From a paper:
The HINT1 protein is a compact and symmetric dimer, with two adenosine pockets at opposite sides.
We then made an H114A mutant to inactivate the hydrolysis activity of HINT1. The negative stain EM also showed little effect of Ap3A, Ap5A, or AMP to induce HINT1 filament compared with Ap4A. Therefore, Ap3A and Ap5A are not able to polymerize HINT1.
Numbering used by the authors:
A (entry chain A): 14 to 126
B (entry chain B): 12 to 126
The structure:
C-alpha cells in the first residue's frame, strides 16, 4: 500500500501505537504530537493527497472522519478537538499518503496555522 | 426547517446573504467572512448536524462529500500550491457555530502546529 512511511506502518513493517484498525483504515498516535492527544486516521488505499481523491472514494473519506470521531471519544476528548487534512506544500503536508489528523486535550487556537 | 436554526441554516435557505462557491442537494460552499488566509471558505451539509461528535454512521457519505467538494472548490479557486482542511469540534476545537463545517484555507504557507 504505497512507498511512504505510512505504507510501512500499514504493512506492520515498522511500529506505531495503533488505536483502531479495520479492513480499510488504520488509526495510530502521531510520532510528533502537537497536543496531549494527537493521532492520525489513514486509508489503507494509497491515495497520495486529497487533491487527487476520486469520487468513488467519497464514502472512504467519510469513514476516516467517523473513525476519527469514534477514536476521539474513546480517548476521552469530551471538551472537543480539531481534525486536519493537509494538502501540498502550502498545506504543510508532510507525507504523501492522505491522513486525517485529530488533535485535542488542550485549547486549539485560531488561526489553525 | 431544512438546514436548521443557526446562521448556516439561514444561509442555506437564502435568508441571509453569502458568497457562494458551489451548491448541490447535499452541501454548500461559501466564503468565510473572517478569512484567516488569502482564500478561506466553508463547506457545510444542508442537513443540520450540530457537530462532528454527534454525526451518525450513515452520515459517512455526506461527510466524505464535504471533503470532495472542498478539494474541487480549492482547485477551481486556483489553490494549486496547497491548502489545509479543518473541522473544529466543540470548545477545545474552537467551534462556535453548532452546524458542522469543513474550512479550507490556502493562498499562503500554513504553519505547524495547526493551532
Ligand atoms: N455569515 C457568515 N458568513 C460566512 N462565514 C461566517 C459567517 N458567520 C460566521 N462565519 C465564519 O464560519 C466559521 C465558523 O465559525 P465559528 O468559529 O464556529 O464561530 P464564530 O463565527 O467565530 O462566532 P463567535 O461567537 O466565536 O464570535 P466571537 O469571536 O466574537 O466570540 P464572542 O465574543 O461573541 O463570545 C465568545 C464565546 O462565547 C459564546 N457566547 C455568545 N454569547 C454568549 C452569551 N450571552 N453568554 C455566554 N456565552 C456566549 C459565543 O458563542 C462564543 O463561543 C468562522 O470562520 C466564521 O468567520
Amino acid at each position: 500500500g504505497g512507498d511512504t512511511i505510512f505504507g510501512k506502518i500499514i504493512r506492520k513493517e515498522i511500529p506505531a501505537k495503533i488505536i483502531f484498525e479495520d479492513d480499510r483504515c488504520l488509526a495510530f498516535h502521531d510520532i510528533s504530537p502537537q497536543a496531549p492527544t494527537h493521532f492520525l486516521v489513514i486509508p489503507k488505499k494509497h491515495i497520495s493527497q486529497i487533491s487527487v481523491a476520486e469520487d468513488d472514494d467519497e464514502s472512504l473519506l467519510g469513514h476516516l472522519m467517523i473513525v476519527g470521531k469514534k477514536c476521539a471519544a474513546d480517548l476521552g476528548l469530551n471538551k472537543g478537538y480539531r481534525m486536519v487534512v493537509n494538502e501540498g506544500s502550502d498545506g504543510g503536508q508532510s507525507v504523501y499518503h492522505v491522513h486525517l489528523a485529530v488533535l485535542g486535550g488542550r485549547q486549539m487556537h485560531w488561526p489553525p496555522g
